[PDB]
Design a protein around this nucleic acid. Structure first.
Ligand SMILES: [Mg+2]
Ligand SMILES: [Mg+2]
Ligand SMILES: [Mg+2]
Ligand SMILES: [Mg+2]
Ligand SMILES: [Mg+2]
Ligand SMILES: [Mg+2]
Ligand SMILES: [Mg+2]
Ligand SMILES: [Mg+2]
Lengths: 214, 65, 149, 64, 135
RNA sequence: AGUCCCUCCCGCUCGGGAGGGAGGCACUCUGGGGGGACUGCCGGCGAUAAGCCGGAGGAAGGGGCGGGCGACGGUAGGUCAGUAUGCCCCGAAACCCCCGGGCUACACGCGCGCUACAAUGGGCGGGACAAUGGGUGCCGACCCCGAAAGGGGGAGGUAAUCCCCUAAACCCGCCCUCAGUUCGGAUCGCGGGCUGCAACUCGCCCGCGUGAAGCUGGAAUCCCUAGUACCCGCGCGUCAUCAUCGCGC
RNA sequence: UGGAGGUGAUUUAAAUGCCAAA
């Protein structure tokens, strides 16, 4: 199936997974600019040394952040698209090899379908899927109310990544589509502001609810 | 339609029902009222030097102790 | 070039293809009806699994000799699904391994060290190393970094 | 909480007054002096005492 | 005839590496490094060599013996040993400075180990506990 | 690991490997002793005190990380069915033995779990990498017989020497393609075995056959802050035989 | 330091005490 040249691939430059360069990737949003790490790096696997320190996740390559985000089950204690998705034993939790392969194949599909650098498309997707205003809850007379507040950039990035991962997880659940194809489809849809993307619709709903309660 | 960037210059304190909200002072970087300093409520971790994207620049948070 | 210079599975495939020319290697008469261990569930699907198993055993003896039946039984075991009970590890059977070793000895590729097990003869070592060299010659045309080794 | 212990302070003050001209603002010198001038056996307690003595020396030299 | 030996440790995996003048051949327990699988493990070992440069890479031979741990633990110990052997063999501080910028752990190691388990559902972990019921 | 000798392989050997013997304590390891971190250094806040916040260097930074040790008392909390013990009872039975039953029953309510409801998979062939512990009423390599479970001999070991002991999740190739199915494996029929004085009530293992509910779960509610949680197997205790458990790795 | 007065306000719903001590 897979050619031997791909099974035994030897890199010679410091670039993401030995296949893509992030030299020409630019971040349009001024707020997310210092929180999307794009430094040159070959292997995106830091062995979880960043979670100890405050704001430590800022200097972690974005591809590894995506890999960590999809390394989960997906629907444990809340419903996504109206269903619990409890993978359990068959879940991808604690298997970083499989998540790495899924991300690699998704990037290949994205590059084939659009002809652009996959990291650029990922950056566009997270830029379009990050909300700008949220709400917090108050209690009065046994009734719950909302009050509009602003979001810090790091939380924006976290929410965007989680929503992309959840949409990809929901698309491949008990259907004929595979995980890599679902991830590529979700990223491409989110990059074009298409309402069929789970993340973009979620962002629109969040901002609408926040606006209607100023 | 795209909001206005603002820069955080001071941290005041935590607030909210469960201590989830922080009150900060920001300076507008762009738009009609560029250069003005107003206070705002923020959800999520934040530090001096961050940049927020406000959707409107006329609402000011009530001062907390 | 030696056995250490090539991936294991490709070498096993090539050796299995080559072993069909040796008259002393023949599947037993009960071969078409058995499983390869109590932890399996269905019969082997390849019509020539016997040669694959024999080639694997030969390469195993090359690398870890001397070795006996019990340790090989440990090697070919695996995890078993037990219905409503949790999965567990189990060993394999003995007849297949013993018959394969006896046939290999009859072919002159291995010999018996008393009280210790079975080891690879010079003839078998040459037989394996020649195929390994051929495979490496084929392989380095597409991976230029292998020319150094 | 890095709160100094009472007996550490007491022994450090006793040592400082007994030999005022024996300790400097260097941690190693005070460590050796504390090792030789008492019967302390724990390496941790020795370090605590030496550190507090160093602080006392630099505080009195400054004149409070 | 220079011979240099270095050691690397990572969560019960121990690697011993020997470096000398050569043609660029690197072997892990006798296997060429270009055939290590899976890919994520192969790239872990190759990073110090790629950082050093091709001229240095083709001028030395390295042989590593590693035991203990798992398939990912063994790769990291080999990586540490190779990095230390490289910085010692060439003995230039520009390369040592470059390694610290890219990954500090290449030279200082990783001291993390497992935490011993405790009662109340001991087999699962030191902190995981049995589900609690009231009625 | 370097050095020497012998034997065997490959591209026929410039070069590259594997065993064995000499030889060595370099490296790993084992275990005695010692060093190392003290808010010690630098900048702020506080009072100039007690301290707090942030940096350098460092394997390690602010109880460095994980454990043992639980004050005066209370809870008429649990235990006289572990042992010790007052009073009351039985004292030819309520004491001591032997045989057969029961604690394993079954319209139903509840606790903690295991296996699943499939592709973030099922099957078949092939390829990789551990640690803690235990062994003479015992662990048993190695050879032979058998399709399997098992059977007949039997080296070494009172153990850093011999054995349990070549883990699984993971990777490569082929079949299945969203279906109550090549998902799930409850229930039942026939046959073959082991332990034991005894296997029906009432044990565990293997082969062929059969093929139940289940297609993600209402109101509610539990655990967890880093080598932690999730996922994956292994060791010991109990033990003639029997682990969906406890304690550990 | 410690006291005495005055004016304002004060975000849904939320009843009961068996068994035993005897
Ligand atoms: Mg296997
Ligand atoms: Mg299963
Ligand atoms: Mg653990
Ligand atoms: Mg009581
Ligand atoms: Mg009972
Ligand atoms: Mg099935
Ligand atoms: Mg019965
Ligand atoms: Mg279904």
């Amino acid at each position: 199936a897979k050619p031997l040249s791909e099974r035994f691939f030897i890199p010679h430059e410091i670039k993401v997974m030995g296949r893509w360069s992030t030299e020409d990737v630019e971040v349009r949003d001024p707020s997310l600019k210092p929180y999307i790490n794009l430094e040159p790096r070959l292997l995106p696997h830091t062995h979880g040394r960043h979670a100890k320190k405050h704001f430590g996740k800022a200097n972690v390559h974005i591809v590894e952040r995506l890999i960590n985000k999809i390394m989960r089950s997906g629907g444990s204690h809340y419903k996504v698209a109206g269903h619990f998705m409890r993978r359990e034993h068959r879940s991808l939790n604690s298997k970083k090899v499989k998540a790495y392969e899924v991300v690699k194949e998704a990037f290949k599909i994205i590059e084939k379908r659009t002809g652009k650098n996959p990291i650029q498309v990922l950056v566009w997707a997270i830029e379009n899927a990050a909300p700008r205003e949220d709400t917090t809850s108050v209690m009065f007379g046994g009734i719950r109310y909302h009050v509009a507040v602003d979001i810090s950039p790091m939380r924006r990035l976290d929410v965007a990544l989680r929503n992309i991962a959840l949409g990809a997880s929901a698309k491949c659940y008990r259907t004929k589509m595979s995980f890599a194809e679902a991830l590529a489809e979700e990223i491409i849809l989110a990059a074009n502001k298409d309402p069929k993307s789970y993340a973009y619709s979620k962002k629109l709903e969040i901002e609408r609810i926040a606006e209607s309660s100023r | 339609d795209e909001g206005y960037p603002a820069e955080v210059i001071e941290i005041i304190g935590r607030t909210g029902t469960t201590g989830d909200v922080t009150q900060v002072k920001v300076r507008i970087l762009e738009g009609r009222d560029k250069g003005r300093v107003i206070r705002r409520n923020v959800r999520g971790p934040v530090r001096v030097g961050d940049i927020l994207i406000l959707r409107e620049t006329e609402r000011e948070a009530r001062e907390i102790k | 070039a030696t056995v250490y210079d090539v991936p294991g599975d490709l070498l096993v495939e090539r050796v299995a293809q080559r072993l069909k020319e040796i008259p002393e290697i023949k599947p037993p008469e009960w071969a078409p009806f058995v499983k390869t261990g109590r932890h399996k569930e269905r019969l082997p699907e390849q019509e020539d699994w016997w040669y694959y198993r024999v080639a694997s055993i030969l390469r195993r003896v090359y690398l870890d000799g001397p070795v006996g039946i019990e340790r090989l039984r440990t090697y070919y075991g695996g995890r078993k699904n037990r219905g409503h009970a949790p999965e567990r590890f189990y060993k394999a059977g003995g007849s297949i391994i013993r018959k394969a070793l006896q046939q290999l000895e009859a072919a002159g590729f291995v010999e018996k060290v008393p009280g210790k097990g079975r080891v690879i003869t010079p003839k078998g070592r040459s037989f394996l190393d020649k195929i390994a060299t051929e495979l490496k010659k084929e392989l380095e045309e597409i991976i230029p970094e292998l020319k150094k080794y | 909480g890095k709160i100094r212990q009472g007996f550490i302070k007491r022994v450090a003050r006793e040592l400082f007054n007994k030999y005022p001209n024996e300790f400097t603002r260097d941690f190693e010198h005070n460590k050796k002096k504390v090792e030789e001038l008492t019967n302390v056996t724990s390496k941790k307690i020795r370090n605590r005492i030496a550190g507090y003595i160093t602080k006392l020396v630099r505080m009195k030299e400054e004149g409070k | 005839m220079r011979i240099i030996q270095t050691t690397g440790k990572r969560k019960t995996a121990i690697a011993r590496a020997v470096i000398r003048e050569g043609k660029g051949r690197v072997r892990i327990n006798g296997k060429p490094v270009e055939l290590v699988e899976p890919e994520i493990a192969r790239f872990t070992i190759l990073e110090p060599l790629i950082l050093a440069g091709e001229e240095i890479w083709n001028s030395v031979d390295i042989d590593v013996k590693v035991q203990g741990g798992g398939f990912m633990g063994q790769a990291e110990a080999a990586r540490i040993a190779i990095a230390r052997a490289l910085v010692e063999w060439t003995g230039d501080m520009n390369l040592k400075e470059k390694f610290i910028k890219y990954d500090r752990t290449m030279l200082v190691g990783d001291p993390r180990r497992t935490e011993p388990h405790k009662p109340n559902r001991s087999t699962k972990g030191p902190r995981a506990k049995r589900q609690k019921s009231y009625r």
